[PDB]
Design a protein that fits this description.
The protein is about 20% helix and about 35% strand. By secondary structure, the chain is α+β, with helices and mostly antiparallel strands. It has a single domain, classed as Ribonuclease A-like domain (P-30 Protein), CATH 3.10.130.10. The chain has a four-stranded antiparallel beta sheet with strand order 2-3-6-7. This is Ribonuclease pancreatic. One of its GO terms (biological process) is defense response to Gram-positive bacterium. Endonuclease that catalyzes the cleavage of RNA on the 3' side of pyrimidine nucleotides. Acts on single-stranded and double-stranded RNA. One of its GO terms (molecular function) is RNA nuclease activity.
Length: about 120
């Protein structure tokens, strides 16, 4: 069974120097990571930092989660990310995204023992 942590690695971790693909990063990645199985996930962020750097955010700046939980953590440093937002013409199962590369502070929900990232909440 997939842990909440393994799920966050599947949905969000793409440890890469920058962000690379053959055609359209978001179209390929949303499909290859099973984010277009049950539906086109409308928005999804991938983080191109090491797993260690991302896990470390759970000991960085404590902020409120978008849903009102207080177990969210903002990265002290900006991180190399890519945002995937479904296009207007996107129709399942042929999910179509606009790829937006950025360098921003990530906010993640941290949970468990050990205390590790389990949701991607926002970037600032």
């Amino acid at each position: 069974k997939e842990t909440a942590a393994a799920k966050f690695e599947r949905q969000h971790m793409d440890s890469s120097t920058s962000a690379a693909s053959s055609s359209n990063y978001c179209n390929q990645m949303m499909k290859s990571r099973n984010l277009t199985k049950d539906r086109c996930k409308p928005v999804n962020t991938f983080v191109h930092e090491s797993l260690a750097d991302v896990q470390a955010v759970c000991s960085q700046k404590n902020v409120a989660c978008k849903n009102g939980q207080t177990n969210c953590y903002q990265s002290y440093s900006t991180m190399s990310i890519t945002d995937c937002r479904e296009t207007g013409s996107s129709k399942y199962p042929n999910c179509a995204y606009k790829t937006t590369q950025a360098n921003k502070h990530i906010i993640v929900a941290c949970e468990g023992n050990p205390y590790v990232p389990v949701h991607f909440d926002a970037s600032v």
